Automatic annotation (TrEMBL), chain A:
Lineage: Viruses, Riboviria, Orthornavirae, Duplornaviricota, Resentoviricetes
Protein origin, superkingdom: Viruses
Native source organism of the sequence: Scylla serrata reovirus SZ-2007
Protein name, per record: VP3
């Protein structure tokens, strides 16, 4: 997954091992939309100023 | 051979050339062995040779 992204930089990763492939590890990823804060609010002037 | 008894000069046709140094330097061990197994490998970047 890491190598697939080709956004802005050339990521290089060495081949791991023939036996270290199945090692497990925990990595969380938030899945919540962030477009509901950018609505038109009656208090936006305070947001801009601060 | 008419001028030198033995020289570092060869005539092999290159294959799978490397773009420039510091990429062959950090690639991996036993991963570059496959490169040399298939035949000659050429490094393009200019060097300071004496």
């Amino acid at each position: 997954r890491i190598t697939e992204m080709v956004n802005d930089r050339r990521i290089m990763i060495q081949k791991l091992t023939l036996a270290e492939k199945p090692q497990v590890m925990r990595h969380v990823t938030t899945e919540i939309n962030n477009d509901l804060f950018f609505k038109m609010s009656p208090v936006a002037q305070l947001y801009i100023y601060h | 051979n008419r001028f030198f008894h033995l020289h570092p000069i060869v005539t092999n046709q290159p294959s799978n050339t490397i773009k420039n140094a510091q990429l062959w330097n950090e690639m991996r061990l036993e991963q570059q062995v496959e490169h040399i197994k298939a035949g000659p490998v050429r490094i393009i970047g200019p060097f300071h040779v004496t």
